[PDB]
Subunit: 635 residues, 3 copies
């Protein structure tokens, strides 16, 4: 075999996990939407791609969403000029599909499980309460003069009103631009100024991990260089005294108290911008295509059912919260989780106390969280029930098989489907993932593309498609899909240069990928992070997976630098578990052998640096420029 | 019987008036008896009433986009929804669709202050003038949702201003012509409107209203008003501020006579109407329009060729609903009466009916008591057979005035519909259907479609089930035309109507349901007087006083008394003919107190009676009892009362 | 016969031209939509007029355009108060019907044949390319804050992006106000200020006939007195260095490169204004959306017998209404190919039109009598040796086509195998009002023939105001009822709208033209009523006399006007241009003026002979092509000259008359 799966301590033949009992409609669990085998996935997937897929997408579009005006055309446009259209003649409102229609059917159903930073302060937020709070905010924005198409920045932590802020903008046709509450005043400034918003929504302070986020302090600093912000809505989250600029700044509760608890929905066109999410690339998503994509993926990738309680542990400052905390779940009318704390506050058992308390049916987090909890021991999880869960999802980066097994062993008790969901902020929704009721998973493989995704592997040098299996290269998409980002706000040139120009005719994700002998897709990491040693292209996940196979390795990050013998050299930055006593033990040799043993001599790191902890909310570009979190520069 | 009807000189058994011949079978919409009213009413309330309202909504109004949901929300948080997904335009349903069917049909009977200047305004003429004004507003930058203040007298173009705002999706805020510069100021500043429509001068009762003069004074303290449209009503020279002020006729001559209709959502605000801080009551589009359309059709048994005469002003909700939106929504002829009931003489109302053959008349007890005060010579020698229904609104109509209305104006051949409602209800809430309900003088009778009201004991706070009960009036469920909020003050909206009795809407009136199920509105809860644990209503005492020969108008209030808790103080106005020099003032006040003792009881006898020439009232006609209460309590037409009491 | 056709050298009996074979569905040409005879035109026309025509218009409205929301009422309003309504409850978007729906069907089909001033720089613009550029400009306009209902002035030459600028404004619901590229800074200034636009679209420089149009220079001068214009979008047409005002002025390409290539369509109501077109105070003619779009679509389809694969070539400019209706909206609404001709008829040579036809296989041609008379003045070498068989229909617009020029058109341009459609209408009619349907009507040189669908026209005595029933009658032209494409107002001046067209003859629309209906029912437009000359109580029309003069060998173009005469009331004065080869030295001018005056006396009558004739090199004309007779009238007797093409001619005329 030319394509090698990610290094795992378990042999290959023992590493195929079929849909487990809970995903078979047994043990009181509902029937999956797609099952029972791979063939059932292909039967349905084949309808969503190719020349006869307008019928399927038109039906799913009209069955999944409530429309004000029906659409005539299904799709149009393409990558070349960035004019992708989906259901253009149709009109709808995202807030209507995520709130109103569910409020009209069951007003008392819980929409949001607000898991506060402190476990006792948690509570359920019904669709009625959330709709009221959203219409109040919408009415406040309209009183500030926010019109259809105006940008509104959101700088809110993971409190339940953050969904009301999002949907308040969507309800009136405003483009919300969410900014993670941990971002600095300098980062916020850049995003508030780029979107040219005139209104900003934020908190007095945020609460995460028992520590205070000085949000209103961070806003006041940024706004000194944001001349366009005239109105700032401040939610009273902590109540601590914060500066309030008279005239500009108003309190959420006081403003909403003046407005009615209903607000009419603006009739939006499918291609009206729904939100900007800065990554700075202000990635722009439309309404219908994005909403439909997030709705379908949640239903099928997480096998969501009406009475399910979906728990996505991301932040609404990232696309994961946009798609799989707010728009996706609420569009399907189920319960979604707004988790305000960290995975290790008050203790590393928080995720599991949370599931058992609410009987969560699915969990969705990142490899960074999984590897963190793995470094903290199985005592915080071994003594839990967790039988409510049926599907466990991972997103953000390649999940090392060791973490995948840790995930499957303890969190799922070997009875949950593990969905490795690959996608980007620009894809809008999950692009490659196993349907839990049909796909047998391989640790660290996103498996097969989702409905509407037709992806190929291309040789980056020649630009030629590699037909068949056992191939490796860069990942691309053949055709647009509904939830694809439509542009980069006021920088369409950068939108085309980044995703459409490198390989004309396709969408360029920026990831190296490989399709193994069985057809499973393997995402190996960013193309920029690849290392070419003696003409052999090493992927970042391949080497890092081997290092964590060594007992005591907690997290790694390999980067390259030009070597005067091999072209490029592998340099490693390794974090050890807290128990590995580096005073008694002199290790860097045992790790390099681990690479030489599992990968090959060419992959052996030329130098290894043992470090205590750069990451986002892993910055390998930082590690590259250093060799070419100040401890890294010192070590 | 525990619940007592309003004192009447006619004994009870002789005081039930069945639907008279004119309201008998062409055919009324609901008839011929009470059961015919209940069979239909039952469809409009309860858990199975969506079918009826969905049908009525789609049959009564033209929609751009149909609605999916019928109703949602409730009182608790003030999120009432009706037909939310639907879209429509008020101007389209009041003008366009009728212009398309019969453009030459008369929409407005403009009865000018001088009878000779009257004329008919067709739907074509009204629609053109409405599109012209709408085109002017759009040229000023008025967008959907922007507030526009209207300060116009009772000239027919006032309907054009209303519907012009509704046509483009602007929220008009009408202010009664004659309010001071200060009252206007507060309403213009609260709604934050950037455009104001008014006249050069108004004409009412042979007197000139200096509207533009009052506007210029107010705008000195209204910084947001950039454009003022001035209608040339009299032509007398008035100041015009360059840039800000433009002439109605000159502006409209630049614009086309058609304007596209803004596609409004059911719950988009239609107008703000401030009540005498100033409470800006807000009404939506679909629910309000439907309510005013249905009530007009069923409460006044309106048919296509009728000529509806509501003698109110467009500055009050009565003019909003039953001069403009209600009648014109049904596509009939409506009256814009610019004069007073007594100009040139007290025969004006009746000269008006016979001139135009009015089929219904709608006015207030304050006007009825006025004509009663002016003698029956001005009405006895008129025909008035065109009328089928006579309506009363604003406050309880004493049975003494009810009979005068019934005897002379209707010649005992018209149904008398006592219509109870408020600005916040949008449309008539309790009233007898004239083709089905037998009336009692001073009784609103039974609730309208969509209104399910109960009596609640204010002490216990519990609903009193059954008949022969008395308490405070409340509604069980929202209805389409209910006000949606108070402009930029939703808290005051909830605290005033929804929080006092959670789960219900609190009107603010004491009411009683007699042994037959008839509802009796006895006056404001604030006006109730607690004498030794007995709650006296203002209607009970004032009705007894006007029964005494010579009494023109009365108003009783309460004040802190030691032995009985509160004491009843009376302010009585005598007819101008009453020789108060020949009769002793003490002898008269004694006969009045005994009159109260005879029909109500000893506890109701006024501790002191004050003979005054006139009582302080608002411009809508309501009597200002709060003022009389604070004056008697020593907490300093108002200079005469404070001086006489001393 | 009382009504006389325009003087023609061909006798009458030899002057009836039936639909030729190319218009009969033979030779493989498509079948006409209406044919084959007059009875077939009236059969369909009668459905479009009177009180029983709502069914037809509702069906055509729903068959011709894609609607977001359907309409309930078909028509309402009238002339009296200027409240004309058509399909009011309906909603649609012009850009959607001219671009989107055609992009969705065949994105690679050519929408615009861009014939640049230089033939080599020409190319085809697909519906995909035009839609993308239109959505980009719309997105730029939205980024400038342009809202539904805002005016946007366009000062663009005849480059294909002018269609993108138009449709970008319509796409977002903006009212574009086009001004012909070449108007002075003063004419532009007055039009930018009247529409109160805050955005202006223009080029750095224009190119027409090998000459440079200093568009940005004229814009910079005009905007010095236009305080409301905050943003100027400048298209890079030539690339020559032009002044750019920092902040205000931005480059089309740089701005569009920042925006996506798709933009949602604004849902416009039928009666929302689509554009303002000022005519030479400035008269801002306003057109609505649905009715205008329907009219331009139907007229193009039926007056030019347009079929899906046709290549329509309207040689006008988007600065006047002919380009609005029969370069952009009409053709693109039908989803066919249209031509953006940037040059002149004689650049590089007078063979350009014909090089153009054979180059692109144009299926129809649409130009003005001034262009036809120009090419006739330049000799048959430039046209005789061309194929031109792609053509099936040849159109004339702007003024009466003299029978002499009509024959030249029919003989050389059509090689006696094309239908000649003389299309009468005004900027205020929106679309062609009177014209022969080429597959059904047999034509007479210089006759607009019969009214188009929705047009019911009468002849009225201008003095008595009475309708002249029947045939062989003469008077002034009026319309009985509103039609879909009729102008709805004059921008912010509805008073001038009513006083000009609705008040003169209450109950009708007053075109301002003298007309006559001959014994056969054919309509004859005789010229402006203002241009009529009263000689001894005889009402002379400008078309009959000018047609008579051009019958004289050597005459290129003429223009007669009226003047105060002390004996006959008014006297006929003539301005005649001879072909360049005509030796005015060998032939005596006084002898020519005698032969011309006799030519007029022989065909018309003694009263029609010009009292004085002036030989001039050219005439004062506008860019639309109609001769400015008011200028010649006021000069002869001893003010709205914005469209004056060559102001130099007025100085030669003022010298040659004094
Ligand atoms: N399952 C996965 N397996 C391997 N790589 C993965 C996987 N999910 C994400 N990635 C990497 O994340 C980038 C995009 O991240 P971003 O769009 O910034 O954040 C978004 C990403 C999804 C939610 C937050 C991809 O281009 C990849 O490199
Ligand atoms: N038929 C009636 N019988 C007894 N009382 C009545 C009756 N009609 C009104 N009222 C009192 O008027 C208030 C409302 O006043 P307002 O807000 O001006 O509403 C407008 C609505 C029409 C004119 C007043 C009620 O709440 C009552 O107190
Ligand atoms: N076929 C024709 N036969 C005789 N006269 C005609 C003909 N077409 C136009 N006209 C005269 O042009 C005026 C309108 O000019 P304009 O407003 O520019 O409209 C534009 C619309 C087309 C180009 C001019 C008419 O009122 C007439 O006088």
């Amino acid at each position: 075999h030319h394509v090698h799966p990610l290094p795992d301590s378990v042999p290959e033949s023992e590493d195929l996990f079929a849909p487990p009992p809970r995903m078979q409609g047994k043990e009181g669990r509902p029937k999956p939407h797609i099952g029972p085998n791979y063939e059932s996935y292909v039967k349905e997937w084949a309808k969503t791609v190719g020349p006869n897929s307008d019928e399927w997408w038109a039906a799913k579009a009209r069955e999944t969403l409530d429309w004000y005006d029906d659409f005539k055309t299904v799709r149009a446009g393409g990558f070349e000029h960035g004019d992708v259209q989906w259901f253009p003649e149709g009109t709808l409102n995202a807030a209507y599909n995520c709130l109103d229609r569910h409020y009209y059917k069951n007003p008392k159903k819980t929409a949001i499980i607000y898991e506060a930073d402190e476990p006792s302060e948690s509570r359920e937020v019904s669709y009625e309460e959330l709709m009221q709070e959203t219409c109040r905010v919408a009415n406040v924005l309209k009183s500030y003069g926010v019109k259809k198409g105006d940008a509104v920045s959101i700088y809110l932590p993971m409190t339940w009103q953050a969904a009301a802020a999002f949907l308040a903008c969507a309800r009136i046709g405003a483009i919300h631009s969410a900014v993670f509450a941990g971002f600095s005043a300098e980062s916020l400034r850049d995003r508030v100024n780029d979107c040219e918003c005139k209104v900003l929504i934020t908190t007095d302070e945020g609460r995460r991990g028992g520590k205070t986020i000085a949000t209103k302090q961070i806003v006041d600093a940024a706004l000194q260089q944001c001349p366009l912000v005239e109105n700032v809505l401040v939610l009273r989250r902590t109540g601590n005294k914060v500066p309030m600029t008279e005239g500009r700044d108003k309190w959420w509760d006081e403003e909403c108290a003046k407005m009615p608890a209903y607000c009419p929905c603006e009739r939006m066109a499918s291609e009206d911008p729904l939100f900007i999410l800065y990554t700075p690339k202000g990635v722009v998503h439309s309404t219908a295509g994005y909403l439909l994509g997030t709705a379908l993926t949640l239903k099928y990738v997480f096998d969501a059912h009406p009475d399910d309680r979906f728990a996505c542990m991301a932040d609404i400052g990232w696309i994961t919260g946009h798609s799989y905390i707010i728009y996706g779940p609420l569009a399907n009318g189920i319960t979604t989780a707004v988790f305000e704390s960290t995975p290790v506050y008050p203790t590393p058992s928080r995720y599991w106390d949370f599931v058992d308390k609410w009987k969560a049916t699915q969990l969705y987090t990142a490899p960074t969280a999984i590897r963190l909890l793995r470094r903290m021991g199985e005592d915080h999880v071994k003594n839990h029930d967790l039988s409510s869960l049926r599907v466990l999802g991972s997103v953000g980066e390649p999940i090392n098989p060791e973490a995948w097994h840790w995930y499957n062993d303890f969190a799922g008790k070997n009875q949950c489907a593990i969905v490795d969901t690959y996608w980007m902020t620009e894809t809008g929704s999950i692009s490659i993932a196993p349907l839990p009721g049909a796909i047998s998973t391989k640790p660290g493989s996103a498996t097969f593309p989702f409905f509407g995704m037709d992806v190929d592997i291309i040789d980056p040098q020649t630009g030629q498609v590699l037909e068949g299996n056992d191939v490796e290269g860069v990942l691309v998409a053949r055709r647009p899909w509904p939830s694809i980002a439509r542009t980069v706000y006021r920088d369409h040139k950068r939108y085309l240069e980044t995703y459409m120009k490198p390989y004309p005719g396709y969408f360029f994700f920026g990831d190296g990928a490989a399709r193994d002998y069985d057809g499973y897709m393997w995402i190996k990491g960013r193309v920029d992070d690849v290392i070419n040693v003696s003409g052999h292209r090493l992927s970042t996940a391949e080497v890092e997976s081997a290092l964590i196979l060594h007992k005591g390795v907690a997290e790694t990050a390999v980067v390259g630098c030009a070597d005067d013998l091999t072209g490029q050299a592998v340099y490693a930055f390794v974090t050890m578990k807290p128990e590995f006593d580096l005073k008694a033990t002199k290790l860097s040799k045992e790790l390099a052998i681990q690479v030489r043993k599992v990968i090959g001599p060419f992959a052996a790191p030329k130098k290894i640096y043992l470090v205590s902890d750069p990451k986002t909310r892993i910055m390998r570009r930082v590690l590259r420029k250093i060799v070419a979190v100040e401890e890294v520069k010192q070590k």
